[PDB]
Amino acid sequence: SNQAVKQRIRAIKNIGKITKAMKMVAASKMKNAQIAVEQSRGLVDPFVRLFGDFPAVNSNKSVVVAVTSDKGLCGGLNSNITKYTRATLATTESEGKDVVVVSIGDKGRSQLTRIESQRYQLAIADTYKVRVTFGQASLIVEELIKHNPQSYQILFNKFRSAISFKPTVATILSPDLLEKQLEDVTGNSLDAYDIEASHERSDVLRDLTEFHLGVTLYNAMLENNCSEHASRMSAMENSTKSAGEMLGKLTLDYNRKRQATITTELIEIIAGASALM
């Protein structure tokens, strides 16, 4: 029973160096993937200063995406997104609107089914294995365009810094299925612009909203990956703290057992010798 404690110290110390490695790994991945996150942050801005921000609009059909992580030591990031999924998905509910929920990342596949199982249709996963590219987000936008709602919702975590990732809902409306219908006030605000397309405005907005979905989906799953790495860096920071305080308790209790072992073996030896002399 004195060797159960020594091997438990062995287990806690190897766990405490594993988590300290994974903290530095997450910190290394957070800096060389922030060099790709705030590069892609720019292209979201022309579409929001062109189309605006219309989250609570009365869509007939809506596809909501919660883009989450694939690996699992992120520390309550994906669960916070799973709760903001229903927190922003009940604020849409005004007339009995249809909703399709979709998860990007393996840890959203397991977590939305507990709350919304009949409204689940697609799981995109293995997305951060090599990297995130725009052709990939384009294909995910294509399969979100196969069924064609009137609105899109993307739920992710905006990578502010290595401390805060306050989560974000970004909204993308189908071209004149609801978007220009949300633009017409005493005329319209979209009619200021000269459409310089080949075909009509109804097709330049058709192309323009697929490009907006691809840009928003790319930036969402890039910001979510960088916030995942920083959340894992903050999660394995508390794991080495816990595996150090548990190690210190176990080291103190081992010192007690070591002292008691020497005392009890000594008392046995003295009692053996005193029964002869």
Binding site: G72, E268, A271, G272, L276
Partner: protein, 281 residues
């Protein structure tokens, strides 16, 4: 998983209130169920040696062996806690001598020494009061010879001597699952098998709380049922695969659709080996 032949001594070692007696009472009650069905030559006569127990604990067993009917074949050698320390030291030898009658005259015996760890405390008391010099924890030097003199009397005799048999079940109580004790490591070294009962498996629902990874039988496939030799070879082959995958999948990292198969199949087998209290199958 840990089958037992006739003439084999098998240690039922476990922590404080596991199912140690309940394994041994079920081995005795089951011999009553088999003695009605076998011919007269291959009937097993059981002896339960109760060392250092309560006197009302053993009165609950005479009441259980009567209302099952196992008392027709059972001798109970009862050296309770109020008996003198030489009566509890000597009661495993008295019960072995009452059970060696059936071994020496061609019949089959089953001796159960409940708490040999309480016989050695009765032996330590006399040895320390006869001023014999103490050794490990306080025990006399000859406390290995105390138990190996006794457990080696459990034998399967040759056919010249009658073909008789005596099967021992020493019971050893550990303190915190610490099998590295003095009396525990002696009887582990003497007996052939080992039925290690765990208190953490007891409360997970797994009753009999048999640690299938630590429980051995040195006779093994030599003296088990041939109808279950070809089935329980697969059973321990799968439960060995169940154990390491559940150490990983309780963290909750990832699962692999065949790693998912072995921790879903091994849960079918773990629930299969559960059992009620006094119903030997």
């Amino acid at each position: 998983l840990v089958p037992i032949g006739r003439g084999q001594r098998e240690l039922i070692i476990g922590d404080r209130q596991t199912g140690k007696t309940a394994v041994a009472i079920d081995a005795i009650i089951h011999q009553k169920n088999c003695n009605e069905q076998v011919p007269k030559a291959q009937r097993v006569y059981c002896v339960y040696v109760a060392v250092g127990q309560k006197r009302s604990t053993v009165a609950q067993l005479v009441k259980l062996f009567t209302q099952t009917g196992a008392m027709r074949y059972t001798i109970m050698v009862s050296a309770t806690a109020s008996d003198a320390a030489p009566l509890q030291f000597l009661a495993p030898y008295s019960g072995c001598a009452m059970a060696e009658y059936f071994r020496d005259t061609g019949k089959h015996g089953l001796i159960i020494y409940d708490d040999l760890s309480k016989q050695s405390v009765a032996y330590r008391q006399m040895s320390l009061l006869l001023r014999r010099p103490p050794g490990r924890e306080a025990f006399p030097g000859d406390v290995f010879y105390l138990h190996s003199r006794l457990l080696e009397r459990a034998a399967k005799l040759s056919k010249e001597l009658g073909g008789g048999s005596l099967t021992a079940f020493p019971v050893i109580e550990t303190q915190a699952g610490d099998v590295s004790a003095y009396i525990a490591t002696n009887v582990i070294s003497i007996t052939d098998g080992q039925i290690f009962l765990e208190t953490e498996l007891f409360y997970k629902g797994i009753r009999p709380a048999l640690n299938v990874g630590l429980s051995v039988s040195r006779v093994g496939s030599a003296a088990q049922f041939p109808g279950m030799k070809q089935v329980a070879g697969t059973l321990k082959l799968e439960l060995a695969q169940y154990r390491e995958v559940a150490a990983f999948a309780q963290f909750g990292s990832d699962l692999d659709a065949a790693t998912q198969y072995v921790l879903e199949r091994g849960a079918r087998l773990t629930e299969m080996l559960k059992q009620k209290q006094f119903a030997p199958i």
